[PDB]
RNA sequence: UUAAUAUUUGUUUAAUGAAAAGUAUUUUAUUAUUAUAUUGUAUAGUAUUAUUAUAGUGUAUAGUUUUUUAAAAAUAUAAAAAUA
């Protein structure tokens, strides 16, 4: 029903919108709009302790 | 390209042999007569929306 | 509506895996490339250890004093150690109702990829492209 | 005739339940009335006490056929079947039996 | 509480063994839970049709397919047990099969009485 | 306000939903069981027991004893049909036979079965399944179906065939 | 009532309309999550006699 | 709302709320079974509903006998 | 034929929501595909 | 004319056949007796020979199909097609391999006749 | 002439070339998972004329294997038993 | 005549096992059973469970 | 507000031609001089005769 | 071994051969005149006899496109009759006892 | 009769385990390992082979393979200049 999707010489960002299976290095906007029941995408790994702790203490002494 | 010149063409070539094994001359032959009746029907359901439904 | 980039670009600072690689959990070596069974963090840093972003395993993502998954897929590192945040806070071991020595955290830094580093890296990049010189 | 049938009909024209059906095949249930009828009619004999007692006809006895085609010919009783309450007369009712042909022995 | 042993409703196993429908031996001294009963009928159809979820995400009696028939089970035996598999409590239900022998004029019997080749495929065989 | 209730006759009319006959019509693979037991079943078991009622009933203790004759004919004249596969040591070699068992038996009866009346005494290993009778349809199209069985591959020591001359 | 009249917020392409095909048992095996469902005494005995 | 027969061989709309039938796909007409109806009655075994009992005597007759 | 689409024999006007249904029945088959269930016809009684 | 939908067909080739390096002496008057056998011949160029690469590529996918996975997917696609309504599709059980070993064997002589 | 072979293939990565032939086929086919099949593959009773249709006769290589299925999806009671 | 062992068993024999192959390798042999009373641990506050899974 | 047609009213679409070059109309052919079958001028055969003279 | 598996398939069929009628049964009147121990030895006799005969059946059921009717199908009735008529005189001695 | 009708039209697959539900003739469905009786494994529902991924775990590059047609009006969507 897209117009981008219609025209005969699809444009690179149109054949990434088309990127919806789950695999590495895929389209991650495109599977993150679809639900999380649809999608395995976890939460995101945040990592938190003394090395991002000390870094920040610095720079903020 | 008719289903019922095909029809007709398989009841040709059935007649055809029918009257070559009567004795009849092959190049010599003519529909002499040709005619359909109705037969057997069939029934088939035809669901339509809104709780309807009709018998093809 | 997400509100974040796709295929983020790594002109600037390219994200690789190294060719020695440990564990934080474990300090013990994983697979490179072959198997995904790693999850990378990365987060653009050279900061010790395992610079550019450090590496668990599927198996041992997992808090190293209770031995427990993470609460919402976020580790507190304790002197070399992942601890959990209830572990990190100091209060009482709670068993989850979900899975127990496993979390729900994705392969090869597919979870971690929707954040971080993105193009353009610095202002002084831009400049450079939009200049003839 | 089916494949014939089948060559006449039409590639587009689909018809399905070919190897499975929506209703269980597997419910008991009755015949249609002709078809009842039928089984009635050929098989009269399955009716409780259908054969004639007392019995009187015994293969050796010479008899007369009263009524019928061959009517006022005499004949030896060959076969007594019983339960149908049917005589096999000798040279009386005489007719072919078509064999039907088989690998190596043709139509007799 | 109930005739039969609390196994049958939840095995003495943490994944539910020796769950079902147990038909007993009349002069065995087991008793099962095949009762048919106007208010055993209800739970007796339940196992029958609908099976028993156990709580470790397993149907024990019946998954589907073809319903179990309690009426032909073989006579229970015993009860179940940690250690082995089974434990043969009544030894008296199990068939032990035993014919005699030859003693006697056994050499002369035969399937039939006496009264006083080449095989070829047929459509039907009167005697 | 009432009903002209004196122009009926004293008859009890058929409920509206009529009852469907108890007989099951069902000859199918999810065909089951009926739990509930009526009075004919009673009946006929007196009779075929103790002749019920043209003869008196033995006391309990014959009755519930091993001389009652059911247990008695069924542990000295035992009725198992148990009936082997040929499509399964027929002009092949296997360390597995297939039988067809009644649905009454065990392993371990199947066991005593075989080393008792054929003598087969390397037996490994019995594994059973329940499977429904074969169900058919004659030319008038009268359901019909066959006895139930219990498909049992039975593992043995040594592989036996049966050689069919060609 | 919400989508269809009948079938209310039960959507056709979400779930099954009637889940009690004939008679459904209530009860599961082992709601309880008790160390030894077996009975009072079954097996090994439990504590000293007496 | 029932603008014809109430028999399913009828030939006019009918609805389910009035004249409710079980579903039968095909099935034969008044006169006598077409030949959409023999294609399954040769090729199935029987007609593709599954309500008519296979009543083949008299073909049984006609070979085996 | 070419006389008759001159003339205009025949239905001038054709069926609109087809051309999306037919996608939308693709992507089903797809969905059952990954689902691992048989394809079914989209119009079986409505033909 | 395509019975399903009445349209026309039409052959669509090249021309300079003989002063090809594929395709020298083919004759599409009738094709092969299997899809993935090399197509037919003409007795006058029997002696004719293929380029290397596109012999080896093509034997490459001919071979995909003397699989019994390919036999699988052929009665599958038997009982897809039946279960579709599609008529005149045989029944799984009385199809037939399209590729057998007696089969092969006297395509590869055949081949090996036509070099 | 050195095509890839599944059997070869899971002789080189040591990957039971049953289970790894699975791998590459429906679950439903091989295990005990919950998969839809086509009436037309089941097996039908024979006819006068024609003799019977079996599923595994027809399909050998999508039976399901049990052995593979208790190994790799059914839990064991050996691991679990604690006297 | 073998023992009728269970899995918690064949994990108690696996730590004496290891516990007896550190003990001929010659590097401290760390039994963990030995730090085990009955309150618990001796000194971990920490929960351990036999049979332990994969 | 449509009623029932007479027979007089559906013989009515025969008179024109519309109904006639769709039905009622015959082929022009000949005798194919390489196949010896029925042919129509414009249409040819699959055959590496019937495709360089195609007649 | 294979000689306890050779009694369960008939001989003739083997051999492709027509197996013969047998002459009668055991009728009730000449197993009066049995000892219970004779009477279930002819019973296991036709025990293994009546299983043999129901393989020979399940396999002619199994094969009835390739392999006609199975032959001589009266042997199944006679040995049905058998032990009938076993059964018989058995509940008779034990209502006497 | 409408009805030479409306409707269908099978040329290109991005995703992974139950239970309710469904019983469709699994001919020995599987062939084996362990141990130890018994019991049961393939297919929903919306009157259908229907706008349809039933979200219970779990994670992921297997492309995990049925949508005709040679111009037009009206209509339906999408786009739609250096005019306002
Ligand atoms: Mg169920
Ligand atoms: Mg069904
Ligand atoms: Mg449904
Ligand atoms: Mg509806
Ligand atoms: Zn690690
Ligand atoms: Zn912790
Ligand atoms: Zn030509």
């Given at each position: 029903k897209?117009?981008?999707?219609?025209v005969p010489?699809?444009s690179?960002?149109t054949?990434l919108r088309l990127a919806?299976?789950?695999?590495?290095?895929?389209?991650?906007?495109?599977?993150?709009?679809?639900?999380?029941?649809?999608?395995?995408?976890?939460?995101?790994?945040?990592d938190?302790?003394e090395?991002p702790?000390?870094?920040?203490l610095?720079?903020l002494? | 390209?008719?289903?019922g010149?095909?029809?007709?063409?398989?009841?040709?070539?059935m007649?055809?042999q029918?009257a070559?094994?009567?004795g009849?001359?092959?190049e010599?032959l003519?529909?002499?007569?040709?005619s359909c009746?109705?037969?057997?029907?069939?029934?088939?359901?035809?669901?339509?929306?809104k709780?309807?439904?009709?018998?093809? | 509506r997400?509100?974040?980039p796709?295929?983020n670009?790594?002109?600037?600072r390219?994200?690789?895996?190294?060719?020695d690689?440990?564990?934080?959990?474990?300090?013990?070596?994983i697979?490179?490339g072959?198997?995904?069974s790693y999850?990378?963090?990365?987060?653009?840093?050279?900061?010790?250890?395992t610079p550019q972003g450090?590496?668990?395993?599927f198996?041992?993502?997992k808090?190293?004093?209770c031995?427990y998954?993470?609460?919402?897929?976020?580790?507190?590192s304790?002197?070399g150690?992942a601890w959990?945040?209830?572990?990190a806070?100091?209060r009482d071991?709670?068993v989850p109702?979900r899975?127990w020595?496993?979390?729900?955290?994705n392969?090869?830094?597919?979870?971690?990829?929707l954040?971080?580093?993105?193009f353009?890296?610095?202002?002084?990049?831009?400049e450079?492209?939009?200049?003839p010189? | 005739?089916?494949?014939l049938?089948?060559?006449?009909?039409?590639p587009?024209?689909?018809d399905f339940?070919?190897?499975?059906?929506?209703?269980?095949?597997?419910?008991?249930?009755?015949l249609?009335?002709?078809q009842?009828?039928?089984?009635?009619?050929?098989?009269?004999?399955?009716?409780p006490?259908?054969?004639i007692?007392?019995?009187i006809?015994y293969?050796?006895?010479?008899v007369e056929?009263?009524?019928?085609?061959?009517?006022g010919?005499?004949?030896?009783?060959?076969?007594?079947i019983?339960?149908?309450?049917?005589?096999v007369?000798?040279?009386i009712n005489?007719?072919?039996?078509?064999?039907?042909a088989s690998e190596?022995?043709?139509?007799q | 509480?109930?005739?039969?042993?609390?196994?049958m409703?939840?095995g003495a196993?943490?994944?539910?063994y020796?769950?079902?429908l147990?038909?007993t031996?009349?002069l065995?001294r087991?008793?099962?839970?095949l009762?048919?009963?106007?208010?055993?009928?209800?739970?007796?159809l339940?196992?029958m049709?609908?099976?028993?979820?156990?709580?470790?995400?397993?149907?024990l009696?019946?998954?589907?397919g073809?319903?179990?028939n309690?009426?032909?089970?073989?006579?229970?035996?015993?009860?179940?047990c940690?250690?082995?598999?089974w434990?043969?409590?009544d030894?008296?239900?199990?068939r032990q099969?035993?014919?005699?022998?030859?003693?006697?004029?056994?050499?002369?019997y035969?399937?039939?009485?006496?009264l006083?080749k080449?095989?070829?495929?047929?459509?039907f065989?009167?005697? | 306000?009432?009903?002209?209730?004196?122009?009926?006759?004293?008859?009890?009319?058929?409920?509206?939903?009529?009852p469907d006959?108890?007989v099951?019509?069902?000859?199918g693979?999810?065909?089951?069981?009926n739990?509930?037991?009526?009075?004919?079943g009673?009946?006929?078991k007196?009779?075929?027991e103790?002749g019920?009622?043209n003869?008196?009933?033995?006391?309990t203790?014959?009755?519930?004893?091993?001389?009652?004759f059911?247990?008695?004919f069924?542990?000295?004249?035992?009725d198992?049909?148990?009936?082997?596969?040929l499509?399964?040591?027929?002009?092949?070699?296997?360390?597995?036979?297939?039988?067809?068992?009644?649905?009454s038996?065990?392993?371990?009866?199947?066991?005593n079965?075989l080393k008792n009346?054929?003598?087969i005494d390397?037996?490994?290993?019995?594994e059973?399944?329940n499977?429904r009778?074969?169900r058919?349809?004659?030319?008038?199209?009268e359901?019909?179906?066959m006895?139930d069985?219990?498909?049992?591959?039975?593992?043995?020591?040594?592989?036996?065939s049966v050689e069919?001359?060609? | 009532?919400?989508?269809?009249?009948?079938?209310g917020?039960?959507?056709?392409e979400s779930?099954?309309?009637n889940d009690?095909?004939?008679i459904?048992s209530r009860?599961?095996?082992?709601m309880?999550?008790?160390?030894?469902?077996?009975?009072?005494?079954?097996?090994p005995?439990?504590?000293?006699?007496? | 709302?029932?603008?014809?027969?109430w028999?399913?061989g009828?030939?006019?709309?009918?609805?389910?709320?009035?004249?409710?039938?079980?579903?039968?796909?095909?099935?034969?007409?008044?006169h006598?079974?077409?030949?959409?109806t023999?294609?399954?009655?040769?090729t199935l075994?029987?007609?593709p509903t599954?309500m008519?009992?296979?009543?083949?005597?008299?073909?049984?007759?006609?070979?085996?006998? | 034929?070419?006389?008759?689409?001159?003339t205009?024999?025949?239905?001038m006007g054709?069926?609109?929501?087809?051309?999306?249904?037919?996608?939308?029945?693709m992507?089903?088959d797809?969905?059952?595909?990954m689902?691992?269930?048989?394809?079914?016809?989209r119009?079986?009684?409505?033909? | 004319?395509?019975?399903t939908?009445?349209?026309?067909?039409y052959?669509?080739?090249?021309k300079?056949r003989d002063?090809?390096?594929?395709?020298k002496?083919?004759d599409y008057?009738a094709?092969?007796?299997?899809?993935?056998?090399?197509?037919?011949?003409?007795?006058?160029?029997?002696g004719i020979?293929?380029?290397?690469?596109?012999?080896?590529?093509?034997?490459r996918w001919?071979?995909?199909?003397?699989?019994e996975?390919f036999?699988h997917?052929?009665?599958?696609?038997?009982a897809?097609?039946r279960?579709?309504?599609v008529?005149?599709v045989?029944?799984?059980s009385?199809?037939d391999?399209?590729?057998?070993?007696k089969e092969?064997?006297?395509?590869?002589?055949?081949?090996l006749?036509?070099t | 002439?050195?095509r890839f072979?599944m059997?070869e293939?899971?002789?080189?990565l040591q990957?039971?070339?049953?289970?790894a032939?699975a791998?590459?086929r429906?679950?439903?086919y091989?295990?005990?998972?919950?998969?839809?099949?086509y009436?037309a593959?089941?097996?039908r009773?024979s006819r006068?004329?024609?003799?019977a249709?079996?599923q595994?006769?027809?399909?050998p290589?999508?039976?399901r294997?049990?052995?593979?299925?208790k190994?790799l999806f059914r839990?064991?009671s050996?691991?679990?038993?604690t006297? | 005549?073998?023992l009728?062992?269970?899995?918690?068993?064949?994990?108690?024999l696996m730590?004496?096992?290891?516990?007896?192959?550190?003990?001929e390798?010659?590097?401290?042999?760390?039994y963990?059973?030995?730090?085990?009373?009955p309150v618990?641990?001796?000194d971990?506050?920490?929960t351990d469970?036999?049979?332990r899974?994969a | 507000?449509?009623?029932?047609?007479?027979?007089?009213?559906?013989?009515r679409?025969?008179?024109?031609l519309?109904?006639?070059?769709?039905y009622?109309?015959?082929?022009?052919?000949?005798?194919?001089?390489?196949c010896?079958?029925?042919?129509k001028?414009g249409?040819?055969?699959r055959?590496?005769?019937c495709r360089q003279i195609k007649? | 071994?294979?000689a306890?598996?050779?009694e369960?398939?008939?001989?003739?069929?083997?051999?492709?051969?027509?197996?013969?009628?047998p002459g009668?049964?055991?009728t009730?009147?000449?197993?009066?005149?049995?000892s219970?121990?004779?009477?279930?030895?002819?019973?296991?006799?036709?025990l293994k006899?009546?299983?043999?005969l129901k393989?020979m059946k399940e396999?002619?059921?199994?094969?009835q496109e390739?392999?006609?009717?199975?032959?001589?199908?009266?042997?199944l009735?006679?040995?049905?009759?058998?032990?009938?008529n076993?059964k018989?005189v058995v509940?008779?001695?034990?209502?006497?006892?």
């Amino acid at each position: 029903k897209e117009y981008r999707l219609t025209v005969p010489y699809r444009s690179e960002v149109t054949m990434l919108r088309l990127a919806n299976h789950k695999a590495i290095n895929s389209n991650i906007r495109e599977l993150f709009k679809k639900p999380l029941v649809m999608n395995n995408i976890k939460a995101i790994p945040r990592d938190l302790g003394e090395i991002p702790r000390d870094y920040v203490l610095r720079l903020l002494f | 390209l008719r289903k019922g010149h095909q029809i007709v063409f398989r009841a040709l070539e059935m007649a055809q042999q029918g009257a070559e094994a009567k004795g009849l001359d092959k190049e010599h032959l003519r529909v002499a007569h040709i005619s359909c009746y109705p037969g057997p029907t069939d029934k088939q359901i035809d669901i339509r929306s809104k709780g309807y439904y009709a018998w093809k | 509506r997400p509100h974040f980039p796709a295929y983020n670009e790594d002109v600037d600072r390219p994200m690789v895996v190294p060719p020695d690689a440990i564990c934080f959990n474990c300090d013990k070596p994983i697979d490179a490339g072959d198997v995904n069974s790693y999850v990378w963090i990365p987060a653009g840093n050279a900061t010790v250890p395992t610079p550019q972003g450090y590496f668990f395993h599927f198996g041992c993502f997992k808090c190293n004093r209770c031995k427990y998954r993470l609460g919402h897929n976020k580790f507190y590192s304790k002197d070399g150690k992942a601890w959990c945040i209830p572990c990190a806070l100091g209060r009482d071991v709670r068993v989850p109702t979900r899975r127990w020595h496993t979390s729900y955290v994705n392969t090869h830094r597919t979870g971690s990829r929707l954040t971080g580093h993105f193009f353009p890296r610095h202002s002084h990049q831009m400049e450079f492209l939009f200049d003839p010189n | 005739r089916l494949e014939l049938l089948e060559s006449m009909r039409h590639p587009r024209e689909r018809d399905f339940y070919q190897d499975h059906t929506y209703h269980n095949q597997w419910l008991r249930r009755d015949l249609e009335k002709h078809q009842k009828q039928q089984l009635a009619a050929r098989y009269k004999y399955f009716a409780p006490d259908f054969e004639i007692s007392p019995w009187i006809w015994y293969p050796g006895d010479i008899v007369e056929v009263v009524s019928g085609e061959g009517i006022g010919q005499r004949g030896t009783i060959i076969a007594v079947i019983k339960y149908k309450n049917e005589i096999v007369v000798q040279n009386i009712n005489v007719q072919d039996v078509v064999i039907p042909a088989s690998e190596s022995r043709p139509e007799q | 509480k109930n005739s039969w042993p609390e196994w049958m409703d939840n095995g003495a196993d943490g994944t539910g063994y020796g769950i079902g429908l147990h038909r007993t031996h009349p002069l065995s001294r087991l008793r099962g839970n095949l009762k048919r009963s106007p208010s055993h009928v209800p739970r007796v159809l339940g196992m029958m049709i609908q099976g028993v979820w156990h709580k470790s995400g397993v149907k024990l009696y019946f998954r589907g397919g073809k319903p179990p028939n309690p009426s032909v089970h073989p006579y229970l035996t015993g009860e179940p047990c940690p250690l082995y598999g089974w434990k043969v409590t009544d030894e008296s239900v199990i068939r032990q099969f035993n014919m005699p022998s030859i003693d006697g004029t056994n050499f002369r019997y035969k399937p039939y009485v006496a009264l006083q080749k080449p095989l070829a495929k047929r459509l039907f065989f009167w005697r | 306000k009432g009903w002209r209730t004196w122009e009926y006759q004293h008859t009890r009319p058929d409920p509206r939903p009529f009852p469907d006959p108890p007989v099951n019509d069902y000859f199918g693979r999810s065909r089951i069981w009926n739990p509930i037991a009526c009075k004919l079943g009673y009946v006929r078991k007196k009779a075929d027991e103790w002749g019920w009622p043209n003869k008196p009933p033995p006391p309990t203790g014959l009755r519930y004893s091993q001389e009652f004759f059911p247990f008695f004919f069924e542990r000295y004249f035992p009725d198992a049909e148990v009936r082997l596969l040929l499509d399964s040591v027929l002009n092949n070699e296997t360390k597995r036979p297939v039988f067809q068992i009644p649905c009454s038996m065990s392993k371990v009866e199947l066991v005593n079965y075989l080393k008792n009346i054929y003598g087969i005494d390397n037996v490994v290993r019995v594994e059973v399944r329940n499977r429904r009778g074969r169900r058919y349809k004659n030319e008038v199209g009268e359901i019909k179906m066959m006895d139930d069985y219990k498909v049992a591959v039975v593992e043995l020591d040594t592989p036996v065939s049966v050689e069919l001359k060609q | 009532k919400g989508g269809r009249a009948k079938f209310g917020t039960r959507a056709a392409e979400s779930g099954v309309w009637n889940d009690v095909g004939g008679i459904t048992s209530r009860v599961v095996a082992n709601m309880e999550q008790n160390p030894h469902p077996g009975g009072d005494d079954f097996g090994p005995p439990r504590g000293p006699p007496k | 709302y029932q603008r014809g027969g109430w028999s399913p061989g009828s030939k006019h709309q009918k609805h389910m709320t009035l004249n409710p039938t079980l579903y039968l796909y095909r099935f034969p007409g008044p006169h006598g079974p077409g030949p959409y109806t023999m294609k399954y009655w040769w090729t199935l075994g029987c007609f593709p509903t599954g309500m008519e009992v296979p009543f083949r005597l008299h073909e049984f007759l006609s070979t085996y006998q | 034929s070419q006389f008759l689409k001159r003339t205009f024999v025949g239905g001038m006007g054709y069926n609109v929501k087809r051309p999306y249904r037919i996608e939308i029945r693709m992507e089903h088959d797809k969905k059952r595909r990954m689902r691992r269930r048989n394809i079914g016809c989209r119009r079986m009684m409505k033909s | 004319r395509r019975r399903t939908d009445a349209v026309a067909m039409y052959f669509v080739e090249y021309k300079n056949r003989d002063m090809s390096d594929n395709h020298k002496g083919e004759d599409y008057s009738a094709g092969p007796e299997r899809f993935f056998l090399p197509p037919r011949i003409v007795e006058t160029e029997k002696g004719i020979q293929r380029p290397p690469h596109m012999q080896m590529a093509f034997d490459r996918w001919a071979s995909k199909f003397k699989t019994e996975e390919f036999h699988h997917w052929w009665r599958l696609r038997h009982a897809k097609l039946r279960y579709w309504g599609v008529r005149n599709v045989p029944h799984p059980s009385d199809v037939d391999p399209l590729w057998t070993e007696k089969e092969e064997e006297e395509w590869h002589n055949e081949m090996l006749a036509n070099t | 002439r050195g095509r890839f072979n599944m059997d070869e293939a899971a002789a080189a990565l040591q990957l039971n070339p049953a289970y790894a032939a699975a791998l590459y086929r429906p679950l439903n086919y091989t295990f005990h998972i919950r998969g839809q099949l086509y009436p037309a593959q089941k097996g039908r009773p024979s006819r006068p004329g024609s003799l019977a249709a079996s599923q595994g006769r027809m399909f050998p290589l999508y039976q399901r294997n049990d052995r593979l299925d208790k190994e790799l999806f059914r839990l064991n009671s050996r691991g679990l038993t604690t006297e | 005549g073998t023992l009728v062992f269970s899995q918690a068993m064949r994990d108690a024999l696996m730590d004496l096992e290891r516990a007896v192959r550190r003990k001929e390798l010659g590097l401290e042999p760390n039994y963990v059973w030995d730090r085990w009373g009955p309150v618990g641990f001796i000194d971990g506050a920490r929960t351990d469970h036999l049979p332990r899974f994969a | 507000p449509k009623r029932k047609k007479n027979p007089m009213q559906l013989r009515r679409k025969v008179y024109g031609l519309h109904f006639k070059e769709k039905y009622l109309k015959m082929e022009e052919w000949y005798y194919c001089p390489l196949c010896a079958e029925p042919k129509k001028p414009g249409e040819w055969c699959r055959r590496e005769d019937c495709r360089q003279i195609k007649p | 071994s294979a000689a306890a598996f050779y009694e369960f398939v008939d001989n003739n069929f083997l051999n492709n051969k027509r197996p013969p009628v047998p002459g009668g049964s055991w009728t009730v009147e000449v197993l009066r005149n049995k000892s219970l121990a004779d009477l279930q030895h002819i019973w296991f006799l036709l025990l293994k006899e009546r299983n043999m005969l129901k393989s020979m059946k399940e396999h002619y059921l199994r094969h009835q496109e390739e392999l006609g009717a199975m032959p001589a199908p009266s042997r199944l009735k006679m040995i049905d009759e058998s032990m009938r008529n076993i059964k018989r005189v058995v509940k008779e001695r034990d209502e006497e006892a």
